[PDB]
Design an enzyme around this catalytic site. Structure first.
Site, PDB file in Angstrom:
ATOM      1  N   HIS A  72      -4.151  -8.082  -3.770  1.00 13.49           N
ATOM      2  CA  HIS A  72      -4.184  -7.203  -2.656  1.00 13.49           C
ATOM      3  C   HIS A  72      -4.387  -7.700  -1.345  1.00 13.49           C
ATOM      4  O   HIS A  72      -3.811  -7.600  -0.273  1.00 13.49           O
ATOM      5  CB  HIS A  72      -5.167  -5.856  -3.217  1.00 13.49           C
ATOM      6  CG  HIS A  72      -5.204  -4.961  -1.991  1.00 13.49           C
ATOM      7  ND1 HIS A  72      -4.012  -4.015  -1.755  1.00 13.49           N
ATOM      8  CD2 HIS A  72      -5.937  -4.643  -1.272  1.00 13.49           C
ATOM      9  CE1 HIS A  72      -4.235  -3.341  -0.816  1.00 13.49           C
ATOM     10  NE2 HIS A  72      -5.406  -3.706  -0.341  1.00 13.49           N
ATOM     11  N   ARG A 113     -13.383  -6.196   9.321  1.00 14.22           N
ATOM     12  CA  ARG A 113     -13.735  -5.198   8.365  1.00 14.22           C
ATOM     13  C   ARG A 113     -15.143  -5.006   8.029  1.00 14.22           C
ATOM     14  O   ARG A 113     -15.566  -3.910   7.659  1.00 14.22           O
ATOM     15  CB  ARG A 113     -12.902  -5.397   6.917  1.00 14.22           C
ATOM     16  CG  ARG A 113     -11.367  -5.299   7.237  1.00 14.22           C
ATOM     17  CD  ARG A 113     -10.719  -5.385   5.984  1.00 14.22           C
ATOM     18  NE  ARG A 113      -9.225  -5.728   6.151  1.00 14.22           N
ATOM     19  CZ  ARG A 113      -8.192  -4.704   6.151  1.00 14.22           C
ATOM     20  NH1 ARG A 113      -8.563  -3.649   6.239  1.00 14.22           N
ATOM     21  NH2 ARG A 113      -7.033  -5.331   6.551  1.00 14.22           N
ATOM     22  N   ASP A 135      -3.959  -0.114  -3.733  1.00 11.15           N
ATOM     23  CA  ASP A 135      -4.223   0.923  -2.664  1.00 11.15           C
ATOM     24  C   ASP A 135      -3.286   2.114  -2.734  1.00 11.15           C
ATOM     25  O   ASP A 135      -2.376   2.465  -2.020  1.00 11.15           O
ATOM     26  CB  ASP A 135      -4.032   0.351  -1.107  1.00 11.15           C
ATOM     27  CG  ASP A 135      -5.388  -0.353  -0.616  1.00 11.15           C
ATOM     28  OD1 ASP A 135      -6.341  -0.525  -1.494  1.00 11.15           O
ATOM     29  OD2 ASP A 135      -5.608  -0.639   0.676  1.00 11.15           O
ATOM     30  N   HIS A 185      -2.581  -4.878   2.186  1.00 11.02           N
ATOM     31  CA  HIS A 185      -3.619  -4.448   2.638  1.00 11.02           C
ATOM     32  C   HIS A 185      -3.761  -4.532   4.176  1.00 11.02           C
ATOM     33  O   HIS A 185      -4.843  -3.510   4.522  1.00 11.02           O
ATOM     34  CB  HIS A 185      -4.778  -5.618   2.049  1.00 11.02           C
ATOM     35  CG  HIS A 185      -6.098  -5.497   2.605  1.00 11.02           C
ATOM     36  ND1 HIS A 185      -6.846  -4.337   2.201  1.00 11.02           N
ATOM     37  CD2 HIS A 185      -6.961  -6.557   3.183  1.00 11.02           C
ATOM     38  CE1 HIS A 185      -8.200  -4.706   2.741  1.00 11.02           C
ATOM     39  NE2 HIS A 185      -8.267  -6.015   3.486  1.00 11.02           N
ATOM     40  N   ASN A 228      -8.487  -2.652  -2.662  1.00  8.87           N
ATOM     41  CA  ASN A 228      -9.949  -2.273  -2.456  1.00  8.87           C
ATOM     42  C   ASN A 228     -10.254  -0.895  -2.517  1.00  8.87           C
ATOM     43  O   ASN A 228     -11.430  -0.476  -2.422  1.00  8.87           O
ATOM     44  CB  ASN A 228     -10.200  -3.080  -1.005  1.00  8.87           C
ATOM     45  CG  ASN A 228      -9.376  -2.509   0.284  1.00  8.87           C
ATOM     46  OD1 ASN A 228      -8.049  -2.276  -0.077  1.00  8.87           O
ATOM     47  ND2 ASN A 228     -10.027  -2.244   1.194  1.00  8.87           N
ATOM     48  N   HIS A 229      -9.077   0.175  -2.272  1.00  4.87           N
ATOM     49  CA  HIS A 229      -9.254   1.226  -2.284  1.00  4.87           C
ATOM     50  C   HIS A 229      -9.608   1.858  -3.964  1.00  4.87           C
ATOM     51  O   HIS A 229      -9.862   3.120  -4.069  1.00  4.87           O
ATOM     52  CB  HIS A 229      -8.252   2.155  -1.866  1.00  4.87           C
ATOM     53  CG  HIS A 229      -8.411   2.347  -0.085  1.00  4.87           C
ATOM     54  ND1 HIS A 229      -8.723   3.237   0.613  1.00  4.87           N
ATOM     55  CD2 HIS A 229      -8.194   1.224   0.652  1.00  4.87           C
ATOM     56  CE1 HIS A 229      -8.834   2.743   1.886  1.00  4.87           C
ATOM     57  NE2 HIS A 229      -8.492   1.649   2.110  1.00  4.87           N
ATOM     58  N   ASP A 253      -6.147   7.542  -1.488  1.00  4.69           N
ATOM     59  CA  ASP A 253      -7.016   7.664   0.153  1.00  4.69           C
ATOM     60  C   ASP A 253      -5.984   7.643   1.210  1.00  4.69           C
ATOM     61  O   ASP A 253      -4.725   7.302   1.019  1.00  4.69           O
ATOM     62  CB  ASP A 253      -7.858   6.597   0.612  1.00  4.69           C
ATOM     63  CG  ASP A 253      -9.035   6.231  -0.747  1.00  4.69           C
ATOM     64  OD1 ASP A 253      -9.455   7.589  -1.340  1.00  4.69           O
ATOM     65  OD2 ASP A 253      -9.658   5.300  -0.791  1.00  4.69           O
ATOM     66  N   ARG A 254      -6.454   8.529   2.206  1.00  7.83           N
ATOM     67  CA  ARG A 254      -5.759   8.917   3.349  1.00  7.83           C
ATOM     68  C   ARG A 254      -4.618   9.754   3.452  1.00  7.83           C
ATOM     69  O   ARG A 254      -4.475  10.789   4.018  1.00  7.83           O
ATOM     70  CB  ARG A 254      -5.090   7.326   4.193  1.00  7.83           C
ATOM     71  CG  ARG A 254      -5.740   6.217   4.009  1.00  7.83           C
ATOM     72  CD  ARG A 254      -6.922   5.922   4.686  1.00  7.83           C
ATOM     73  NE  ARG A 254      -7.524   4.899   4.729  1.00  7.83           N
ATOM     74  CZ  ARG A 254      -8.674   4.340   5.581  1.00  7.83           C
ATOM     75  NH1 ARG A 254      -8.981   5.319   6.413  1.00  7.83           N
ATOM     76  NH2 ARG A 254      -9.169   3.151   5.568  1.00  7.83           N
ATOM     77  N   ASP A 294       0.904  -1.329   0.042  1.00  9.34           N
ATOM     78  CA  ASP A 294      -0.001  -0.104  -0.185  1.00  9.34           C
ATOM     79  C   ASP A 294       0.799   1.294   0.121  1.00  9.34           C
ATOM     80  O   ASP A 294       1.861   1.331   0.653  1.00  9.34           O
ATOM     81  CB  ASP A 294      -0.892   0.196   1.243  1.00  9.34           C
ATOM     82  CG  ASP A 294      -1.680  -1.292   1.397  1.00  9.34           C
ATOM     83  OD1 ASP A 294      -1.513  -2.302   0.911  1.00  9.34           O
ATOM     84  OD2 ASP A 294      -2.741  -0.973   2.056  1.00  9.34           O
ATOM     85  N   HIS A 345      -1.057   4.655  -0.514  1.00 10.28           N
ATOM     86  CA  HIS A 345      -2.113   5.540  -0.098  1.00 10.28           C
ATOM     87  C   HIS A 345      -1.693   6.838   0.010  1.00 10.28           C
ATOM     88  O   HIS A 345      -1.624   7.781   0.945  1.00 10.28           O
ATOM     89  CB  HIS A 345      -2.504   5.239   1.430  1.00 10.28           C
ATOM     90  CG  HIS A 345      -3.174   4.141   1.475  1.00 10.28           C
ATOM     91  ND1 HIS A 345      -4.535   3.886   1.002  1.00 10.28           N
ATOM     92  CD2 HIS A 345      -2.912   2.698   2.199  1.00 10.28           C
ATOM     93  CE1 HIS A 345      -5.178   2.722   1.231  1.00 10.28           C
ATOM     94  NE2 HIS A 345      -4.362   2.058   1.880  1.00 10.28           N
TER      95      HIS A 345
HETATM   96 MN   LIG Z   1      -6.413  -2.502   1.272  1.00  8.44          MN
HETATM   97 MN   LIG Z   2      -4.593  -0.278   2.480  1.00  9.25          MN
END
Ligand SMILES: [Mn+2]
Ligand SMILES: [Mn+2]
Lengths: 7, 293
Positions: free
Chosen positions: B167, B215, B86, B242, B118-119, B89-90, B58, B60
């Site tokens: 992922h 989750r 990923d 992940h 997943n993002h 995001d963040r 990741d 991010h």
């Molecule tokens: Mn993820």
């Molecule tokens: Mn992530």
């Protein structure tokens, strides 16, 4: 801890 | 599309104080999305790759840590790369991050590879930062253009018939690699099923078989699930991302699975390093690590 969708 | 100009401007900020933006034009970003999307669709959804290569987890939106990873590992095409998803995001610079990644995919399409996390899904990055970044710095039409591109990313990779990469993790519905190859694109990420699990599931030391996932979607799987999967498909290793891990990488089930996380200082509950895995010409795995600040 960021919110468990995720620390 | 002046790809080289785009790459030059994205790399220009190497050595600046972290946070300094690169603001490409809307037309340039749209071209990156449209051209990369066509390349994703022309290549298999289950990639078949050869080492030596570098594998990252990741990112991010931590653009200056992506630049450090390339500084440690070699800028494309000096090294071949597989990213596990990923990208957005963040972090504060999802846009620079995904634009450099897409630019390198177009520039070196046979030596640079990106999986879907997943993002890379509008339902997630609507609320976790990427939508807000696009609306603030560009417009929502560009966010939709990114979504169309994300919906075409490949899902998994097998390196030299021995390392299975995705992922999230394994699925109770994954019986044959042909099930992955049959997935059609463009697609969104469903909230259940094989594609969901490949992007959302987690290993868990305290679970026997398949368990529930905190989750709120997909599953957890145990060490014996890994061993049976490796034996059934004649694999040596599962490589996934992940989950934030303190050392940047973390082995599971007697080193039959490894988690990679490449964004250091991601998490407020504990410090974490970011790690990148080197796979050499004999498939031996070693690590380059961004230690926490
Ligand atoms: Mn993820
Ligand atoms: Mn992530």
């Amino acid at each position: 801890x960021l919110x468990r969708x995720x620390x | 599309l002046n790809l080289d100009s785009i790459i030059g401007r994205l790399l220009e900020v190497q050595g600046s104080r972290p946070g300094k933006n690169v603001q490409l034009t809307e037309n340039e970003i749209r071209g990156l999305c449209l051209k990369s999307r066509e390349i994703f669709l022309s290549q298999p959804i289950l990639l078949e790759l050869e080492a030596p290569l570098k594998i990252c987890g990741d990112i991010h939106g931590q653009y200056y840590d992506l630049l450090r990873l390339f500084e440690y590992g070699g800028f494309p095409p000096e090294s071949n790369y597989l990213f596990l998803g990923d990208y957005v995001d963040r972090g504060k610079q999802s846009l620079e991050t995904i634009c450099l990644l897409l630019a390198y995919k177009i520039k070196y399409p046979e030596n640079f590879f990106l999986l879907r996390g997943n993002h890379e899904c509008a339902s997630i990055n609507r609320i976790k930062g990427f939508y807000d970044e696009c609306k603030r710095r560009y417009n929502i039409k560009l966010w939709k253009t990114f979504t169309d591109c994300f919906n075409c990313l490949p899902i998994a990779a097998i390196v030299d018939e021995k390392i299975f990469c995705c992922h999230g993790g394994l699925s109770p519905d994954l019986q044959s690699m042909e099930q992955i190859r049959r997935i059609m694109r463009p697609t969104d990420v469903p909230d259940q099923g094989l594609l969901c699990d490949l992007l959302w599931s987690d290993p868990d030391k305290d679970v026997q078989g398949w368990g529930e996932n905190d989750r709120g979607v997909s599953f957890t799987f145990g060490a014996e699930v890994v061993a049976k999967f490796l034996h059934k498909h004649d694999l040596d290793l599962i490589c996934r991302a992940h989950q934030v891990v303190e050392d940047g990488y973390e082995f599971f089930a007697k080193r039959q699975l490894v988690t990679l996380f490449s964004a250091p200082n991601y998490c407020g509950e504990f410090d974490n390093a970011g790690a990148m895995m080197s796979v050499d010409e004999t498939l031996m795995c070693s690590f380059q690590i961004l230690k926490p600040a």
